[PDB]
Structure 1
Amino acid sequence: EDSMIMNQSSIDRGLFRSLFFRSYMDQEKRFGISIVEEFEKPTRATTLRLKHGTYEKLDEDGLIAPGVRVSGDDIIIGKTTPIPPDTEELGQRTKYHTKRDASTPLRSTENGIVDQVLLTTNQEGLKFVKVRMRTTKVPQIGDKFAS
């Protein structure tokens, strides 16, 4: 019924093995005179409503570095947007939420190695990043082939 049998040893030797790249884009938006988004590693204290993934793979500038293995739901771009502060200045020792998280997580079903990170400026002069992820896909039961 249109199936086929493949040699496992040929697969081990590199038959029909391929390479997969996926790129992610993000940029800093401008909402007003002085309301800008920032690429940064958000902290559990100064930001609220963080993603459930892990932020420990981000660098100081909020961007992951190439060569780092990533898994699903990991944060590859760290971005925060400002929020008007609440009355928490009552008795909080500077530990009050002023920013909201807008980070970009890796897709839940995908994982791989960070291949190349690009940082530049858009037409408007704001920061603009692109992250490319690389993985290898080996043939297995269910993959589609054709003559």
Structure 2
Amino acid sequence: NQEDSMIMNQSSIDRGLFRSLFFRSYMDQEKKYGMSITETFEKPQRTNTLRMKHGTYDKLDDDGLIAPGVRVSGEDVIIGKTTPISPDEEELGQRTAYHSKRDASTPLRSTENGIVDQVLVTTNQDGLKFVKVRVRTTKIPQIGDKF
């Protein structure tokens, strides 16, 4: 405790001194205008997805979402948003096969690490499906924390 540094009782920390709970929310929207291209939510596949991220999608359900209680860490994908291949001039869909299912998913921030708390599925005033995911994790006082 030499400067403004301090000595904290580890046993007290163990019991629960200054322990806190942290929440973070993610979100995404269904799509824009269906001009020969639409966007949605659905679990992607390594061989049936174009420009897939370097994380994982095996924690996603049918609609690309994760049920509460599931432990999700780091680069793990939480919202399996998909957006059709756009190799053409108009930036719309295209007559391709495996790569037609181009994704546009959302994962956790690379430094995050916790479990899914709550998932909300609604629509905006434009009738567009909206996904919002809240996750949580415990913060336990470290030697770099400020008090």
- The TM-score with structure 2 as length reference comes to 0.88
In structure 2, the residue matched to 1:40 is 42
In structure 1, the residue matched to 2:88 is none
In the alignment, the residues of structure 1 paired with residue 98 and residue 133 of structure 2 have an alpha-carbon distance, to the nearest angstrom, of 31
Please say if 1:53 is aligned against 2:55: yes
Q: Report SS of the residue matched to 1:100.
A: coil
Q: What CA RMSD, in Å, does the superposition of the two structures yield over aligned residues?
A: 1.4
1:62 CA displacement? 1.0
In the alignment, the residues of structure 1 paired with residue 80 and residue 140 of structure 2 have an alpha-carbon distance, to the nearest angstrom, of 31
In structure 2, the residue matched to 1:127 is 129
In the alignment, the residues of structure 2 paired with residue 115 and residue 132 of structure 1 have an alpha-carbon distance, to the nearest angstrom, of 5
The equivalent position to 2:94 in structure 1, one of 67, 85, 95, is 85
In the alignment, the residues of structure 2 paired with residue 96 and residue 143 of structure 1 have an alpha-carbon distance, to the nearest angstrom, of 48
Q: Deviations over 1:60-118 (max 9, x none)?
A: 111111000011000000011122336x6xxxxxx531121100011101110100000
In the alignment, the residues of structure 1 paired with residue 104 and residue 58 of structure 2 have an alpha-carbon distance, to the nearest angstrom, of 16
Aligned partners of 2:122 and 2:131 also within 8 Å: yes
In the alignment, the residues of structure 2 paired with residue 63 and residue 37 of structure 1 have an alpha-carbon distance, to the nearest angstrom, of 15
Question: Any unmatched runs of 5+ in structure 1?
Answer: 89-94
28-37 vs 115-124, greater mean Cα deviation: 28-37
Which residues of 2 match residues 6-17 of structure 1 at below 5 A?
Answer: 6-17=8-19
In structure 2, the residue matched to 1:69 is 71
The equivalent position to 2:25 in structure 1, one of 23, 26, 32, is 23
Aligned partners of 2:44 and 2:82 also within 8 Å: yes
Q: Report SS of the residue matched to 1:47.
A: coil
1:43 CA displacement? 1.6
Q: Deviations over 1:29-66 (max 9, x none)?
A: 21334422110011223321100001000001111110
**Matched letter for residue 127 of structure 1:** K
Question: Any unmatched runs of 5+ in structure 2?
Answer: 86-92
State the identity as a percent: 83
In the alignment, the residues of structure 2 paired with residue 96 and residue 110 of structure 1 have an alpha-carbon distance, to the nearest angstrom, of 32
**Matched letter for residue 42 of structure 1:** P
In the alignment, the residues of structure 1 paired with residue 62 and residue 34 of structure 2 have an alpha-carbon distance, to the nearest angstrom, of 26
